[PDB]
């Protein structure tokens, strides 16, 4: 430790607010590079430099005050570009070994400190001025390299994640990412991103600008971002008072129910009762030791602890939570997003698609391209501008491209067991983008223009005639798994299914019959494929969280369930004890008034069950087990 801490001091010293470099500072930073060139795989030199806080202590003063020496400026920039490179790229993965895990965490800690240190607007200002000078040349390879490393420096600074677990800030407060983003605006560096994105000859930089822009907007979804306006202050104030009111009210109500359930006399007042005629697990009647009031809602299991699960038996879970940034940041982001869509989207997408098609040996990350089209199409649609603003993406090639990518991800998720989690994440991203394409063609039907309506019919015609889009949903439902994907994937999949069936039904109405890739089609025959009992199990799992599901989610799932049960007459497939337990809890909750469709559907299907049970007593056995299609149909025959 002491060796580096002693030698690194050579760069200079600070006098009040004036920084004085040493006369061999350049040779000194060259020695720091020589240290890094012979660093250990644990990244020990980087941890030592971080402990010595060289970047915060000397490099920021050198860049702010001594940048007139362009060779020294170049040396400092490249040094900190190597130092700031994200930990996942340095180690190659999050390490399995505890020693390397500790080193990774420590390196990432120093990177977090560097990100906080970089928040000074003066650095971005100098960087933007330098970059503004470089682009005026219409240059040497070293000039291009300086542009490259400037872009990569801000990329690396943005890339290292914020520790929301450390910050624990309330909504509308600024995180480290938020403050740094605001500093980008305050420096004017954003204007250069829009120049680079809009200028045609800068296509080589546009691929980097895509990563920069997509890194900035991560915390804000485009729909709520499009929602913002100057009156939001009073809106949030009044709404928060209302939210606090209902929260307090709910706790009061629940308390009183518990208070009435408990007896009034103290916990040692005693007593004992025999439930005459109710036999035990043993040969004789049950003896009950608890208070008299408890028998009003008795179930024998109330005394039991839950079953202890094995470690490897646990399902997947979310590592993320919804947020909103400070109103200043929200307004700035909305302006930037509007200006990017206005000036840059189609040109940048054409450039990025060109690079992804041409430059396959370079292994560029396609997920950013899909993220950007998924984000900006949603923003454009939320603002309901003319479809011309997103013209480039409105073509069949996008559907085929994302289908082959999504099916590749699906096949890899199945085959490449060692990376199935990441393949599932990639597949989920692709599904999200595809849902936006469907929403876009649906929206232009309700436009006033016949030309775009005809274009919509052309796209939808190809999508429904070809096999892949109508087969894909069944392929995903067939291989959904609790370890493989969290429930968010299932929500997206079933909602996309409802939208696909809606547009399919509307398209089938155009002619006496639809012919498809070759066979005469039948909508009811296609829906019969979803009568697989595994699909119903997934639907029931999604239904357990109906109070936490969105209103749109609940509408979509209940609509599809009623259609499948009623019109296909497959009703007996829903006669299940797990479902009946959920129905019992549903009808017991006093909040049932909010869920009229669900309770009426539940009472309807239970009516069918009790009507059958009155005739046939075997239903009480069938209720324990899942049905094959033949059994579902045979139960009505008896």
């Amino acid at each position: 430790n002491c060796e580096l801490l002693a030698t690194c001091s050579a760069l200079g010293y600070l006098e009040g607010d004036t920084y004085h470099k040493e006369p061999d500072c350049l040779e000194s930073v060259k020695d720091l590079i020589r240290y890094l060139r012979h660093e250990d795989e644990t990244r020990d030199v980087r941890q030592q430099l971080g402990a010595a806080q060289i970047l915060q202590s000397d490099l920021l003063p050198i860049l702010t005050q001594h940048h007139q020496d362009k060779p020294l400026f170049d040396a400092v920039i490249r040094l900190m570009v190597n130092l700031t490179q994200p930990a996942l790229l340095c180690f190659g993965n999050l390490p399995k070994e505890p020693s390397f895990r500790h080193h990774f965490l420590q390196v990432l800690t120093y990177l977090q400190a560097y990100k906080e240190a970089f928040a000074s607007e003066k650095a971005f200002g100098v960087l933007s001025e330098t970059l503004y000078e470089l682009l005026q040349l219409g240059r040497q390879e070293e000039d291009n390299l300086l542009i490259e490393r400037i872009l990569l420096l801000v990329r690396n600074i943005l890339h290292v994640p914020a520790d929301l677990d450390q910050e624990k800030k309330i909504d509308d407060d600024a995180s480290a990412h938020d403050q740094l983003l605001w500093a980008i605006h305050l420096s004017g560096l954003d204007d250069l991103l829009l120049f680079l994105a809009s200028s045609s000859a800068e296509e080589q930089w546009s691929l980097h600008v895509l990563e920069i822009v997509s890194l900035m907007f991560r915390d804000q979804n485009p729909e709520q971002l499009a929602g913002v306006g100057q009156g939001r202050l009073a809106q949030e104030r009044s709404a928060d008072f209302a939210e606090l009111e209902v929260l307090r009210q709910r706790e009061m109500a629940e308390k009183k129910t518990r208070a009435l359930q408990r007896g009034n006399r103290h916990s040692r007042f005693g007593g004992s009762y025999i439930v005459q005629g109710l036999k035990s697990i043993g040969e004789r009647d049950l003896i009950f030791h608890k208070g008299l009031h408890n028998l009003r809602n008795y179930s024998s299991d109330l005394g039991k602890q839950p079953k202890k699960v094995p470690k490897r038996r646990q399902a997947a879970r979310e590592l993320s939570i919804q947020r909103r940034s400070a109103l200043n940041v929200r307004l700035f982001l909305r302006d930037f997003c509007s200006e990017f869509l206005e000036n840059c989207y189609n040109r940048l997408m054409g450039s990025v698609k060109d690079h992804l098609l041409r430059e396959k040996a370079q292994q560029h990350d396609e997920t950013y391209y899909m993220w950007a089209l998924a984000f900006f199409m949603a923003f454009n649609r939320a603002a309901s501008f003319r479809p011309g603003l997103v013209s480039e993406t409105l073509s069949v090639r996008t559907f085929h491209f994302i289908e082959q990518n999504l099916t590749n991800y699906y096949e890899m998720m199945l085959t490449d067991r060692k990376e199935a989690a990441s393949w599932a994440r990639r597949m989920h991203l692709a599904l999200k983008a595809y849902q936006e394409l469907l929403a876009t063609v649906n929206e232009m039907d309700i436009s006033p223009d016949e030309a775009v309506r005809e274009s919509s019919r052309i796209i939808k015609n190809n999508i429904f005639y070809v096999m892949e889009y109508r087969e894909l949903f069944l392929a995903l439902f067939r291989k959904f798994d609790e370890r493989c994907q969290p429930r968010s994937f299932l929500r997206d999949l079933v909602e996309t299914t409802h939208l696909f069936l809606k547009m399919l039904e509307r398209f089938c109405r155009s002619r006496g019959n639809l012919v498809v890739q070759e066979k005469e089609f039948n909508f009811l025959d296609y829906l019969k494929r979803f009568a697989c009992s595994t699909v119903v199990r997934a639907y029931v799992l999604l239904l357990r969280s109906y109070q936490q599901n969105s209103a749109h989610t609940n509408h979509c799932i209940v609509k599809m369930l009623h259609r499948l049960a009623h019109d296909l007459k497959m009703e007996a497939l829903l006669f299940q004890l797990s479902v009946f337990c959920l129905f019992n809890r549903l009808l017991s909750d006093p909040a049932a008034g909010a869920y009229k469709e669900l309770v009426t559907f539940a009472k309807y299907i239970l009516g069918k069950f009790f009507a059958l049970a009155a005739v046939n007593q075997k239903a009480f056995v069938e209720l324990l087990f899942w049905k094959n299609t033949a059994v579902v149909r045979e139960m009505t025959e008896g």
């Binding site: 004017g188 250069l192 120049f195 809009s198 190809n462 002619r511 639809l514 012919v515």
Partner: peptide, 20 residues
């Protein structure tokens, strides 16, 4: 078969000085 299939098949600048 043939007629529906046939008819359904047949359907198918600014400088950097300006910004900054």
């Amino acid at each position: 078969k043939q007629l529906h299939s046939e008819t359904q098949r047949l359907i198918r600048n600014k400088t950097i000085h300006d910004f900054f």
